């Protein structure tokens, strides 16, 4: 599914990611935008052969499972497929879990690059949320 943005950021609201940890809302749309364009099936290859699956690119290596990335962790216990389903609540579970972990959310690259230190309220401008 790809999502509006206004659209995500109710949703990703509902799930309590609005300042989960401290991060804003708009941080979390941000992050969501440079991930993945909204799409809960963006899939990309990482080098170290794991791959990102989902609105925030979770991670294989480290977070769930996909068969396929050898010696890897699975610490939200689900299939990686599952981080793309038009239903985001599993992604915004393990989200939780990742922004948790000591690095906030430096975890995503695209948003220490893209959101980090910008307007990241844009992000919700003009939503009704």
């Given at each position: 599914?790809?999502?509006?943005?206004?659209?995500?950021?109710?949703?990703?609201?509902?799930?309590?990611?609005?300042?989960?940890?401290?991060?804003?809302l708009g941080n979390w749309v941000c992050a969501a935008k440079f991930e993945?364009?909204?799409?809960?099936?963006?899939?990309?290859?990482?080098?170290?052969?794991?791959?990102?699956?989902?609105?925030?690119?979770?991670?294989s290596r480290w977070w769930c499972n996909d068969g396929r990335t050898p010696?890897?962790?699975?610490?939200?216990?689900?299939?990686?497929?599952?981080?793309?389903?038009?239903?985001?609540?599993?992604?915004?579970?393990?989200?939780?879990?990742?922004?948790?972990?000591?690095?906030?959310?430096?975890?995503?690259?695209?948003?220490?690059?893209?959101?980090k230190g910008t307007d990241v309220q844009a992000w919700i401008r003009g939503?009704?949320?």
């Open positions: 599914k790809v999502f509006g943005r206004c659209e995500l950021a109710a949703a990703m609201k509902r799930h309590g990611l609005d300042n989960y940890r401290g991060y804003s993945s364009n909204f799409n809960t099936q963006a899939t990309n290859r990482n080098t170290d052969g794991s791959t990102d699956y989902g609105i925030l690119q979770i991670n010696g890897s962790r699975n610490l939200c216990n689900i299939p990686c497929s599952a981080l793309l389903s038009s239903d985001i609540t599993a992604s915004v579970n393990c989200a939780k879990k990742i922004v948790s972990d000591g690095n906030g959310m430096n975890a995503w690259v695209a948003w220490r690059n893209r959101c939503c009704r949320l």
